[PDB]
Amino acid sequence: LMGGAYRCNYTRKRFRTLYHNLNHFPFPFHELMVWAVLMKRQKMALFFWQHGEEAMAKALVACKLCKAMAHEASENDMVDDISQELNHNSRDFGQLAVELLDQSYKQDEQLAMKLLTYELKNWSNATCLQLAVAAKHRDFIAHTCSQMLLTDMWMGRLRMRKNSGLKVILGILLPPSILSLEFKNGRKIYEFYNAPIVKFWFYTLAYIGYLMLFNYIVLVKMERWPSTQEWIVISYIFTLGIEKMREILMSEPGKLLQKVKVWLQEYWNVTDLIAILLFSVGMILRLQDQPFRSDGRVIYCVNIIYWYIRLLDIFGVNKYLGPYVMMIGKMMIDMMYFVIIMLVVLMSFGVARQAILFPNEEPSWKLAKNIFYMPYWMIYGEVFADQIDPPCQLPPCKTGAWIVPAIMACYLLVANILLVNLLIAVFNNTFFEVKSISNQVWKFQRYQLIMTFHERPVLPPPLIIFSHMTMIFQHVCRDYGLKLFITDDELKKVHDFEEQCIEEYFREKDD
Amino acid sequence: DGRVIYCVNIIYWYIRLLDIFGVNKYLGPYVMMIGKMMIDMMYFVIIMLVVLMSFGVARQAILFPNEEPSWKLAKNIFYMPYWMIYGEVFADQIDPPCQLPPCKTGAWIVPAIMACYLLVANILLVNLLIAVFNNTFFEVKSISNQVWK
Ligand SMILES: CCCCCCCC(=O)OC[C@H](COP(=O)(O)O[C@@H]1[C@H](O)[C@H](O)[C@@H](OP(=O)(O)O)[C@H](OP(=O)(O)O)[C@H]1O)OC(=O)CCCCCCC
Ligand SMILES: COCC(CCO[C@H]1CC[C@@]2(C)C(=CC[C@H]3[C@@H]4C[C@@H]5O[C@]6(CC[C@@H](C)CO6)[C@@H](C)[C@@H]5[C@@]4(C)CC[C@@H]32)C1)COC
Ligand SMILES: COCC(CCO[C@H]1CC[C@@]2(C)C(=CC[C@H]3[C@@H]4C[C@@H]5O[C@]6(CC[C@@H](C)CO6)[C@@H](C)[C@@H]5[C@@]4(C)CC[C@@H]32)C1)COC
Ligand code: NA
Ligand code: NA
């Protein structure tokens, strides 16, 4: 029910050995809570939740279990009453976890941050953040305490918080400037270059350089044999493909065919694969005779558009430039239907005009071009009334050519005054929902961004081939970032703080 | 050179009349609202510029494949794709109808990229900017009124 990474306490070899010759339980309310959750007893589970230690972890685990049971019951096509009664339990447990987190952060902040990161021995060594992410709980990760914890994990071991970013670029470009930044309590360089923010900025600078080289090679004349910049671009593409293959192989599932399915879940990955294959085909066709070389160059020119577009993924790290991109992504789906309707009207007008003006044309594929070309250009400003309805020294006028200006006028009135204004109204009246949803989704995906830049080779793709050599040499041979290991006294203090917080929460709610 | 600097200065001194206008009861808050919508517009200009640069580079590389390196290349990318979105969409200056020099290899992609670029720039981003201006106007209006008073 939990997931691939989870490992229950009963299935461990120690408990199998203990159970074979058949004691007690150190935390009985954990077992009773899981029993009540698994047997669809909501009141009993809510009673057992407020007793014992680790209330927030219990709430998140119960939420995940209820969601998984609801999904499985819906899949197994049982009575839909159960599959709708379980989702309510999941929502209730998620709300309890969110309220407990809010109370804990309201009381004390350092203990609240320590609560979300410390390793949980009873729940297969997973922190509260990982349990919340595995449960797809957006309201928990989007909370203020979770966002500040994510910012602390993203900044690395550097204490600069006023105006960052510029200093990171300075340190990347000027290594002597590194030994002037404050650090959290020789080895300073290793801690600087392993922070995820520095990795991200190094990757961004490498991508900017690669884009510049690609623009240079496509703009300037191309010869029989590739120049140096073309070789650099080809090496960048090859190493990026190798890095994508490495990301595929070291994924979460243990099956080679199954990891591909999980990797093909984000659209950026499949678009990257398509672009890399297209670039490989174009490069293969490029090193040939003149016509195939021209075809390869045209493939290069077409392919550069995608690498220009992919800068939005880089922009997505910004606080204000990410939600706008998600809003654009939703507005495209909102715009498709009006594109269809305008296409219908445009085709009608174009066919009518072409049939009226030119009545003695032999069948040719040029006819399919004259329908879409000029009616489409006529709605973006080029409404030249000399080309359409020609003034017919004087060639004879075509029969019925006085209808073309009237049809054009009606078509312009429909297309430029009605549909576009209705589209403006549609965009305007459905903006608040899209804005809130995009903000929540970006705040949730910040965690995945931080994780995927924390687990990444330090060198950018154009010279990442060297960092792939060390993974082969080390083949024959987490202090922080994910978890936080604490002693027994600190664990007891955290448990005391959590019990105080949950008691205060219940008392305040009753009052 | 001094005359050109005079022209730039007359641009600035013409702009500086909004400070004089700022004494009016209704012409001050509008200027402050302009000041904040400037930030929003500058946030959208980056995306518009990315799309524009992509289309310009693609068209320039497709149509002219035998150009020596010159700074004129950096001009042909920004000039015409920018003038296109302000109503000057042409069909003979760009995508030439190729008595006739031979057609360039792959010149049938320029009108399709042009159509997609116009659809993205003139129907999507500008309408989204209109929605952004419209849905965040009451807060800006109240704050500007308070700050002016
Ligand atoms: C070529 C770039 C293309 C990739 C662009 C990659 C995308 C990109 O642009 O980076 C975003 C990042 C901005 O975020 P950054 O951390 O630097 O600064 C934030 C900003 O100062 C806000 O004003 C702060 O408060 P608030 O929010 O107002 O309340 C916020 O504080 P907090 O809330 O965090 O505590 C700060 O985080 O960097 C820059 O743009 C600075 C110049 C660097 C870029 C200029 C140098 C090129
Ligand atoms: C008259 O002959 C000129 C000659 C000197 C020729 O040198 C050339 C060197 C390459 C260079 C600087 C030149 C023209 C286009 C320039 C491109 C414009 C691109 O714009 C950018 C624009 C913005 C970027 C995001 C994308 O690329 C560059 C990758 C690109 C760019 C700056 C690469 C550099 C190119 C001039 C004189 O010598 C005596
Ligand atoms: C140079 O000479 C060409 C010659 C071959 C000529 O064959 C012709 C056969 C009819 C055909 C395929 C041709 C041109 C217009 C084509 C129309 C375009 C229309 O578009 C569609 C567009 C979308 C639809 C919704 C509406 O109609 C078709 C009804 C229509 C359509 C596909 C019908 C088919 C027409 C070519 C070469 O032979 C050696
Ligand atoms: Na116009
Ligand atoms: Na015009």
Using the mean position of ligand 5's atoms as its centre, give its distance from the Cα of residue A284 in Å.
Answer: 43
Q: Smallest Cβ distance to B124: which of A297, A328, A432? A: A328
CA-based nearest residue to A324, from B38, B123, B128: B128
Burial track A395-422 (b if 16+ CB lie within 10 A, e otherwise): eeebeeeeebeebbeebeeebeeebbee
Integer Cα distance of A35 and A15 in angstroms: 18
Going through chain B in order, the beta strands assigned E by DSSP cover none
Sign of the torsion formed by the C-alpha atoms of A260, A261, A264 and A270? positive
Going through B10-148 in order, the beta strands assigned E by DSSP cover none
CA dihedral B73, B74, B75, B79 (to 10 degrees): 110
Burial track A61-97 (b if 16+ CB lie within 10 A, e otherwise): bbbbbbbbbbeebeeeeeeeeebeebbebbebbbebb
A to B CB pairs, distance under 8 Å: 112
Sign of the torsion formed by the C-alpha atoms of A90, A92, A96 and A102? positive
Q: Distance from A354 to chain B by nearest Cα, in Å? A: 18
Burial class (CB in 10 A: 0-12, 13-18, 19+), A505: buried
Q: Distance from A170 to chain B by nearest Cα, in Å? A: 23
- SS3 letters across A388-411: CCCCCCCCCCCCCCCHHHHHHHHH
| Interface test with chain A among B57, B68, B83, by most A beta carbons within 10 Å | B57
> Helix-strand-coil percent breakdown of chain A, rounded to 5?
70, 0, 30
Q: Locate A142 and state its tokens.
A: 């989007």
- Residue B25 in marked binding region: yes
Q: Locate B48 and state its tokens.
A: 């518009």
CA atoms within 13 A on the CB side of A207: 17
Sign of the torsion formed by the C-alpha atoms of A121, A127, A132 and A134? negative
Residue nearest to atom 20 of ligand 3 (CA): A368
Integer Cα distance of B59 and B84 in angstroms: 13
Asked whether A60 and A97 are in contact (CB, 8 A), the reply is: yes
Integer Cα distance of B60 and B77 in angstroms: 7
Integer Cα distance of A15 and A160 in angstroms: 48
Concatenated DSSP letters of A24-69 = --SSHHHHHHHHHHHTT-HHHHHHHHTSSS-HHHHHHHHHHHHHHH
Ligand in nearest proximity to the CA of A361: 3
Q: Does A78 touch chain B (CB under 8 A)?
A: no
Burial track A150-164 (b if 16+ CB lie within 10 A, e otherwise): beebbbbebeeeeee
Residue nearest to atom 25 of ligand 3 (CA): A347
Q: Locate A205 and state its tokens.
A: 């600078």
Q: Smallest Cβ distance to B89: which of A294, A335, A380? A: A380
Work out the widest C-alpha separation in chain B, in whole angstroms.
70
Helix (H) or strand (E) holding A324: helix A323-357
Chain breaks in chain A (C to N over 2.5 A) after: 22, 185, 392, 477
Q: Which of residues 7-46 of B touch A (CB under 8 A)?
A: 43-44, 46
Please report, for residues A321, A326, B43, B132, the alpha-carbon distance to residue B46 in angstroms, rounded to integers and kept in the order given.
Answer: 9, 15, 6, 16
Concatenated DSSP letters of A173-199 = H-GGGGGGS-B---HHHHHHTTSHHHH
To which residue do tokens 């340190």 refer? A171
Please report, for residues A115, A196, A416, A490, A500, the alpha-carbon distance to residue A493 in angstroms, rounded to integers and kept in the order given.
Answer: 11, 31, 68, 5, 11
Report chain B's terminal Cα–Cα distance, integer Å: 43
- Can you name the residues that pair with A484 across neighbouring β-strands? A118
Integer Cα distance of A285 and A308 in angstroms: 22
Please report, for residues A274, A346, A381, B126, the alpha-carbon distance to residue B86 in angstroms, rounded to integers and kept in the order given.
Answer: 34, 22, 8, 12
Integer Cα distance of A171 and B56 in angstroms: 34
A368 lines ligand 3 (CB under 6 A): yes
Residue nearest to atom 33 of ligand 1 (CA): A319
SS3 A152: helix
Contact at CB, B61 and A220, closer than 8 angstroms = no
PDB experimental method: cryo-EM
Q: Locate B136 and state its tokens.
A: 């965040």
Note the resolution in Å, 1 decimal. 3.2
CA atoms within 13 A on the CB side of B52: 21
Fill in the amino acid letter for B20.
I
Residues with CB under 5 A from ligand 5 (ion): A 381; B 87
